[PDB]
Ligand binder design. Structure first.
Ligand SMILES: Nc1nc2c(ncn2[C@@H]2O[C@H](COP(=O)(O)OP(=O)(O)NP(=O)(O)O)[C@@H](O)[C@H]2O)c(=O)[nH]1
Ligand SMILES: Nc1nc2c(ncn2[C@@H]2O[C@H](COP(=O)(O)OP(=O)(O)NP(=O)(O)O)[C@@H](O)[C@H]2O)c(=O)[nH]1
Ligand SMILES: Nc1nc2c(ncn2[C@@H]2O[C@H](COP(=O)(O)OP(=O)(O)NP(=O)(O)O)[C@@H](O)[C@H]2O)c(=O)[nH]1
Ligand SMILES: Nc1nc2c(ncn2[C@@H]2O[C@H](COP(=O)(O)OP(=O)(O)NP(=O)(O)O)[C@@H](O)[C@H]2O)c(=O)[nH]1
Ligand SMILES: Nc1nc2c(ncn2[C@@H]2O[C@H](COP(=O)(O)OP(=O)(O)NP(=O)(O)O)[C@@H](O)[C@H]2O)c(=O)[nH]1
Ligand SMILES: Nc1nc2c(ncn2[C@@H]2O[C@H](COP(=O)(O)OP(=O)(O)NP(=O)(O)O)[C@@H](O)[C@H]2O)c(=O)[nH]1
Ligand SMILES: NC[C@@H]1COc2cc(Cl)ccc2O1
Ligand SMILES: NC[C@@H]1COc2cc(Cl)ccc2O1
Ligand SMILES: NC[C@@H]1COc2cc(Cl)ccc2O1
Ligand SMILES: NC[C@@H]1COc2cc(Cl)ccc2O1
Ligand SMILES: NC[C@@H]1COc2cc(Cl)ccc2O1
Ligand SMILES: NC[C@@H]1COc2cc(Cl)ccc2O1
Ligand SMILES: NC[C@@H]1COc2cc(Cl)ccc2O1
Ligand SMILES: NC[C@@H]1COc2cc(Cl)ccc2O1
Ligand SMILES: NC[C@@H]1COc2cc(Cl)ccc2O1
Ligand SMILES: [Mg+2]
Ligand SMILES: [Mg+2]
Ligand SMILES: [Mg+2]
Ligand SMILES: [Mg+2]
Ligand SMILES: [Mg+2]
Ligand SMILES: [Mg+2]
Lengths: 165, 164, 172, 169, 165, 165
């Protein structure tokens, strides 16, 4: 007996102020958070249908540790396209995740957020190359316009599913 | 790329007047058809979620032939619990399906319809034994009360999934 | 920020064979279970809308009390509301309701626990517990009574939704 | 520009105690009301899909037991005429509810469905065939319902919407 | 007995041509109206889920009066970010609403529409200060791109809910 | 007896690389495909509600030929706003459709895709005039941002419905 929808534990990581919370609140509440209130730790749930399968996303929004990294099945690694340092930090978030999961192949999506802003310092091609080198998808997002937001979370679920088979 | 929901081709068979159409219309329109208008052939579609999977049911409602039996992925074999003859006919519907599919193991559910009526002539235990001998589920239904209607169709989808 | 739907932890209790599992599987899978496979402990989830509010039901399906357990009290202590199920053709299951209710009051350490009384198997002709008797019992406890059939689906949604409504009243 | 779903104004009428409220609450809340609390006037809304069309049912639940009566009957687009299958008198009253509706709508052809409620109860006094003949003589559908078991409940309301749609074409 | 979903009566006001109709049609039909057909009065309904609660939005789309303002529970005050005059008019729409509701505290959201256009004449900071002075939310929208559209309406519903408690 | 939702057979046509596949996958999977994998032929289904009517979209995604054009009830004619040649080709796609349907009045929507790109070579007004000359709607889309994607498909369904009455 099927006992209820499949649950997926997703974790959003990345440097302070890249828009991890804004992405998540946009997904859950269809609301853009304009204020910058730094996060300690928040969790959110949403039921969605992805590729014809109903599921429950349990999303942990982190601060810019080993316990959440151990329980998470997939990770959104978020940088801001106008902050080169946030992009350089991605490497370290990814190594930390691989270390705590004790694995080379953890479901992950690279997210370049704030793509609505004119002040771009990270080229799409650079981020795409970085993602290709990790063998993971790259998505450009804006929590403000909602560009790529659903896609980033759904793509992560699809990565988790590929990794379970 | 997933191209849209899974489709299941379901066929409802059994003797004239057992309630094949009424079952189907109850599923699709939430409507009990009181009149008896014999069917030639009708098809119906419905999108439902079963065990967390979205699917598109394509349901062929038959008359009390080889082409529909060949394209169908699963069969509801319907008799009426107040008509012993309709129950005896099940064996023949099942052989015909096995012959046309050239298969011993075709997804199938045995459906005893009109369970709301007081004139029962087929015992549940007899129908359960028949179903057990075929290795298929048995469900009692009423197109009038809606008892078992969803369950019969959803169980058939689950049988199709096991067989894939 | 609202962080996602409200969750309600429901526990289904009552004597062995009254239809606790059948009720739950009928809710979750729209399927009537004809076989009797005794439960140790099983849990289920379902998202529903009740009174315009989306919620997530976490349902714990328990065993008939046969004997002592410290593990029993722990799982029962997680419930916010309880369906107390008897079978309308089994007078003993109805008499046991009192003991299920005392067990719940003891483990929740409370006199006022959201609860619904469920008389299952109402499709059967062999009725031994009258509707009026069960209604009077429920009235004496100050809780709703619902007659159900896991087979026909009569009252099944209503029993679970009514329990959610009781939980909501108790939170306000 | 389509401006949002189609709205249908439905009115439930019939003798005191036939189950008008219980039918409506069963539709709206999936809840059977066991108590008998007489209604003055209540309205309820529900969005449903019927034959692939999304609509908003605005349902007026009336009293069995008078300027207010004419107003609801005038705004209503379709009527469920409910009797209880164990109460012959409620069945005899149906004719008069139908005439009252025709009078208040000032029309001979009002979308209507005949509903025989309490079909779960053993003490049936109105035969199905009698009710079917009455409905046939009016040219309207007949549905047997139980607010307790939910038998026919959706069907009664959906069938009324289908009647309203036929009457608008 | 709960009688069906909660209903919210919303009114969209603001100067001629700011995009009141376009916002509303985008919400209801997922359609961008490119033509400018001036409105007399139109009403629209939509059922949505906001913060886990199902509700029925009844939306009155107004022309560039006391009766609609009296029955409305919340107001979207819309200006266009490329039209300074529409922004200056907001003050008058707000005073008119306060006068007709006989209230200092009416649920309201300030909407800066046409944020897809390059020809911006109202600074975000100015609009944010105006909204802060009124104690109401500010949202930038585009009926064309759909940026902020759901958020503007849902935020107004959230304001109405806060005001009912 | 209504036998289940209305089905609409939609065909997406236009020059190689304009984003026909990306538009369709964005509609079906909420996913932007960044790679360019040329299509031979693919079909997709989706149930949606448009103007209160539930329907089943059967969408044929074509390559940059008589059989699909004969079974299709409506056509999205897609060009890319940074590719003038794709825009000039529209005329020929439209003639090919009229020829195979043997009809002067085939439901059709003109779609200007890639409207997120800065390298615009086709003016919106030119495309609108072309659409006006055909008596069909014009919609600007981005498969990347999702701007106009639902609108393009829904508008085509509305065109199909007008043509059936
Ligand atoms: N323009 C624009 N602003 C954004 C975007 N995402 C976030 N912001 C803004 O960036 C600021 C920081 O956003 P926030 O979500 O708090 O970032 P964070 O990554 O969660 N910070 P922390 O790790 O401290 O919790 C906010 O003021 C927010 O409005 C975006 O996509 N576009
Ligand atoms: N009481 C009751 N009557 C039923 C039920 N199912 C069907 N009927 C009645 O049985 C009669 C025949 O039903 P119908 O659906 O036409 O049966 P069918 O198998 O499709 N006949 P055919 O093979 O001629 O198409 C109808 O008068 C119908 O109302 C049921 O479950 N209970
Ligand atoms: N006729 C009828 N039979 C039912 C109903 N509900 C349950 N049953 C039957 O009663 C038997 C016991 O049901 P089950 O759900 O396993 O009972 P349970 O309370 O979970 N037993 P346990 O406490 O051992 O887990 C099964 O054969 C089942 O089909 C009902 O409403 N009607
Ligand atoms: N068994 C059974 N009882 C029903 C059904 N419908 C209503 N009842 C019961 O009959 C009584 C009357 O129901 P109610 O819905 O209040 O009737 P009404 O037509 O709305 N009365 P009024 O006209 O005074 O508002 C209640 O006790 C109710 O539980 C039904 O289908 N079955
Ligand atoms: N670029 C862009 N154009 C817009 C936007 N919103 C509206 N428009 C355009 O602005 C014009 C006026 O829009 P309309 O919705 O009719 O505005 P309105 O406030 O309802 N006018 P009125 O008060 O006369 O009824 C239309 O041409 C429309 O396409 C937007 O967000 N972006
Ligand atoms: N920036 C942007 N790129 C897009 C958009 N739509 C498609 N593309 C890009 O353009 C390329 C071609 O898209 P694709 O859908 O394969 O084009 P097509 O019309 O189906 N090509 P074919 O006819 O060979 O099948 C891909 O690289 C894709 O990412 C869009 O709206 N914006
Ligand atoms: N629902 C509360 C829990 C808290 O901890 C969580 C940890 C992870 Cl990795 C994901 C979701 C979570 O949700
Ligand atoms: N949708 C039209 C088709 C026609 O033929 C069908 C064949 C089967 Cl087995 C099932 C459903 C069918 O429906
Ligand atoms: N007279 C016919 C009998 C009974 O019913 C039958 C049904 C089928 Cl599908 C085939 C053979 C049969 O044999
Ligand atoms: N003698 C009857 C027994 C007493 O103890 C019981 C305890 C429970 Cl929780 C339930 C039923 C019981 O039945
Ligand atoms: N929704 C407010 C209305 C007012 O009066 C009503 C009249 C009818 Cl026929 C139906 C529903 C009603 O409720
Ligand atoms: N549903 C029709 C009504 C007409 O008048 C309205 C008045 C307001 Cl404030 C809001 C919505 C409206 O819509
Ligand atoms: N700015 C000059 C006018 C003054 O009066 C106004 C009143 C309203 Cl409600 C709207 C716009 C107005 O603008
Ligand atoms: N169901 C598969 C079909 C194949 O041919 C199709 C033709 C059209 Cl115009 C649309 C969708 C199609 O999908
Ligand atoms: N640019 C001229 C070519 C000619 O042949 C074509 C055929 C089609 Cl279906 C569309 C565009 C074409 O473009
Ligand atoms: Mg944060
Ligand atoms: Mg038939
Ligand atoms: Mg059990
Ligand atoms: Mg009443
Ligand atoms: Mg307007
Ligand atoms: Mg392609």
């Amino acid at each position: 007996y099927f006992q209820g929808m499949t649950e997926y534990k997703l974790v959003v990581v990345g440097a302070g102020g890249v828009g991890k919370s804004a992405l998540t609140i946009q997904l859950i509440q269809n609301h853009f958070v304009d204020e910058y209130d730094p996060t300690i730790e928040d969790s959110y749930r949403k039921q969605v249908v992805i590729d014809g399968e109903t599921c429950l996303l349990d999303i942990l929004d982190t601060a810019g540790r080993d316990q959440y990294m151990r329980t998470g099945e997939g990770f959104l690694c978020v940088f801001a396209i106008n902050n080169t340092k946030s992009f350089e930090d991605i490497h370290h978030y990814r190594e930390q995740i691989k270390r705590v999961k004790d694995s080379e192949d953890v479901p992950m999506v690279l997210v370049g957020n704030k793509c609505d802003l004119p002040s771009r310092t990270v080229d799409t091609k650079q981020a795409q190359d970085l993602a290709r080198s990790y063998g993971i998808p790259f998505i450009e997002t804006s929590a403000k316009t909602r560009q790529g937001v659903d896609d980033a979370f759904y793509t992560l679920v699809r990565e988790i599913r590929k990794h379970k088979e």
